[PDB]
Structure formats: C-alpha cells, structure tokens
C-alpha cells in the first residue's frame, strides 16, 4: 500500500486502534488476571500505553513461560495483557501490510484463509492440475529457528516507519534465532518469514500449485523428479537464506495422501488424521465413562466442525453407532 508504509506508529497508537487492540487482546481472555487487572483502569491504561508507544518508551514485559504437553510438549511463553495488547496494536497496522504481500497460497494466521481454506486449496489444486505427485515439506523447529535478523530484513522492506520498526524490535528483538511461539506478533512474522519460501516457490521456481500453512508446504506436481528438484531448491534456500532445516519431506504420488493441516487430502476425499480420530474417539469414550455426556455435546459440536470438511460421514455414522450421540 504505497510500498513504503512510512508512518505506522501514528496508526498503531491511534486511540481508535489501541481500543481495537484492547478489544482483540481481551477477546476470550475476559476471565484472566491480565484482563481483569487491566480492565480496572482500562482506558487510563491504554492512555499510558498509547503514550508509551507514541514516545518510544514501550518496553515489552518479560515472557511468562510455561509449557503444555496436551497438544505437544511446547514452550509457551505468555505475555502480559499490556504486551499482548501492544502486539495486537502492532498486528492491526503491521499485519495487513505483510499479510497482503503473502502469496494467495499461504494459509496460516491470515484472515479469510485458514486450516480449512488451506486443505481445500490443496484438495482443489489436487483436483484441478490432476497432480500425479506432490512434495510435502515441513520446517524442523520453525519458530525456534526463524532468523530474527533475516526476519527483520522482511519486517523492514515493508515497515519503513522507523518507530514501528523500533516497536517491532521491542516486541521481537532483532537478534537471535527464535521467534517466540505464543505471540501474535510471532504468528505473523513466521508467516512472513516462511513467505520467503513462498516467493521462492511461486516467484523463483515458478511453482503454481502449492500451499503453505506456516511451516508446512505442499507442492503438487506431475513430475516427481521436478518436485524433488523444487524441494532441494526450497531446502537450500530456506537453509542458506532463512536458517530453516527441513525436518520431514516427501515426494509422494497423490495416492499417499497429503498429510496437510490435520487432513489427509486426496483429490477425491479428505480423511482427517488418525491422531485426530483417536484423540476424539478417546475423548468421547472418556466423556461417556466420566458422566460428562453434556460437555461431550459441546466437544462433539466442535469436532463436528473440524470434521465437516473431512470425509467423516462413515466415521460420524460409526461414532453414532458406538455411543449414540448426535454427531452431526
């Protein structure tokens, strides 16, 4: 939007934006110590935050680092509501000036693209193109390997406002190799970072059938030797340019199924991943033999959304036959 973006700290600290950031930061978190300690003097707090950001004295408070194992052993560093609000106020001005240069086929943490628009893009781009083959790649430890230095050569070919840049550099220092997972700022900058490989797939390499979801990159082909080339070129790039090691990759015939984004995406069907089933199966079974068959309806309604995309009719019949509960 002008290829210069050279006055964003004026828009980041607009009261009208910090109120959006505030409502975005509090959305869902209105039962937390952070919201409720902030809510007290909310607009006086946003007036001392606006005026911290406007001054260039905003300093990001220390990450409260816990860790959960239920999804996967992570290393989740939280931020204070003040800090998640500053991040929300950045990523209301700064996000749409990055998320607009993200090629259409990056499906992570950008509005109107999702897990579900991505799996659909892959299935779709699998049906059209009649892909005989596909390269699926994945970045080792993506966030904990993002350069935070060649990231700020992309967060700086676009921000050009030398105060947004210094707010971006408070909210995420320009030195190290570790974009924190559990930052709104970081979802964005990882999509941006990876977006570099998108513009080594789509720009260089002239790959027109792909999808990237944050660190996972599907690349439908037709010649499996070309897709192995593409991968080699993608890995060499993302290693030399971005410091990303490719954990897993494969160049499978579209027949193995593209284990993309929680689904297994053939042209014709889209089985979800067995993990999801087993987790859900077990979750349901537990709910039954826990007397919690009323929160199960809420869980079921949820998983009925994660699976309305997938070809889970058979599975939904099967789960209705095993426990009776109204899946769909």
């Amino acid at each position: 939007m002008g290829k210069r973006h050279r006055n964003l700290i004026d828009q980041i600290t607009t009261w009208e934006n910090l109120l959006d950031a505030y409502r975005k930061t509090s959305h869902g978190k209105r039962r937390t110590w952070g919201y409720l300690e902030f809510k007290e003097y909310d607009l006086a707090n946003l007036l001392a935050l606006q005026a911290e950001l406007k001054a260039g004295n905003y300093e990001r408070g220390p990450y409260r680092e816990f860790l959960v194992y239920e999804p996967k052993p992570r290393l989740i560093s939280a931020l204070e509501f003040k800090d998640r609000l500053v991040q929300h106020a950045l990523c209301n001005i700064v996000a749409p000036i990055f998320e607009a240069g993200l090629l259409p086929y990056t499906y992570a943490c950008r509005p109107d693209k999702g897990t579900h628009a991505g799996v659909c893009h892959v299935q779709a781009e699998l049906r059209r193109t009649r892909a005989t083959h596909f390269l699926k790649s994945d970045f080792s430890k993506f966030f904990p390997s993002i350069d935070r230095a060649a990231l700020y050569a992309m967060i700086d070919k676009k921000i050009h406002c030398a105060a947004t840049r210094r707010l971006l550099r408070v909210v995420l220092p320009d030195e190290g190799v570790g974009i924190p997972i559990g930052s709104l700022t970081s979802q964005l900058f990882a999509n941006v970072y990876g977006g570099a490989v998108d513009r080594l797939l789509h720009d260089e390499l002239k790959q027109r059938h792909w999808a990237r979801y944050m660190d996972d990159i599907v690349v439908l082909g037709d010649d499996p030797e070309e897709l192995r080339a593409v991968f080699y070129r993608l890995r060499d790039f993302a290693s030399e340019r971005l410091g990303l090691k490719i954990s897993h990759w494969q160049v499978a015939p579209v027949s193995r199924g593209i284990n993309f984004l929680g689904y297994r995406i053939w042209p014709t069907h889209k089985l979800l991943r067995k993990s999801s089933v087993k987790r859900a199966k077990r979750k349901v079974a537990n709910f039954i033999k826990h007397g919690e068959d009323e929160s199960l309806q809420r869980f079921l309604a949820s998983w009925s959304g994660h699976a309305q995309w997938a070809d889970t009719h058979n599975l939904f019949t099967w789960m209705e036959e095993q426990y009776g509960i109204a899946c769909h």
């Binding site: 039962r31 110590w33 809510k39 003097y41 006086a44 707090n45 935050l49 408070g61 509501f81 003040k82």
Partner: protein, 122 residues
C-alpha cells in the same frame, strides 16, 4: 507501563464483577423496561442489580468472608428479583426466557462466588 494497579487485588472479585457486569448488562436493560408503574420495584431491583457490584467489590478488597456471604445474599436477592420480575410483576417485566437467560448469568456469578467463598473458607 505496568497497568494502573488497584490495591487489594482479588482475582475472584475482579472475575466475579466482570461476570456480574454481564448480569447487569442483561438485566439492567430489562430492569429499565419495567414500566413507570412498578418504578419502586424497578428502583429496588436496580439497586439490587447495580448494587451487587459494590457487594462483590467490598468483598474483594475487604478480604472478610462476611462480605462474601453478604455478596451471596445479594445474588440470592437478585435471584428473587428475577422470580419477582417474572411472576409478580403484572404487565410482564421479564419474559420467561429472560429469567432463564438471567438465571444462567447469575448462576455463573454464583459459581464464581461459591468458588471464592470456598477458597477463602480454607
């Protein structure tokens, strides 16, 4: 920056009040819809609805279980007011649905008050 601190920060009082603000935000509109007549009942309902926040707040800052039970008595009085505004108020005041909705919100605040009473009682 460090958000403007109140003293005696009680997570439970802050949480209960934010959840009770939803009771107010629901009931205050339908407390203000109560006609001119039934204005004393309304004023008394509004003083029970909007004045329960003070009961929670004083319970939070003056960490004394008495003020928490006074908060419980007020929530029970607010539950009465739902009963009253539904049944005894004649034009209508509160549609049966609205009592069902409000009772859910007050129940949420009831849960939090109960947990808070319990955590203090230990």
């Amino acid at each position: 920056m460090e958000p403007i601190e109140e003293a005696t920060k009680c997570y439970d009082q802050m949480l209960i009040v934010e959840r009770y603000e939803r009771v107010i935000s629901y009931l205050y509109p339908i407390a203000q819809s109560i006609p001119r007549k039934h204005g004393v009942a309304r004023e008394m309902f509004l003083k029970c609805l909007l004045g329960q926040v003070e009961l929670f707040i004083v319970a939070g800052k003056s960490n004394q279980v008495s003020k928490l039970y006074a908060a419980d008595a007020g929530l029970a009085m607010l539950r009465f007011w739902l009963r009253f505004l539904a049944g005894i108020q004649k034009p209508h005041a509160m549609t049966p649905h609205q009592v069902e909705t409000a009772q859910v919100l007050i129940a949420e605040v009831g849960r939090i008050l109960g947990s808070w009473i319990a955590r203090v009682n230990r």
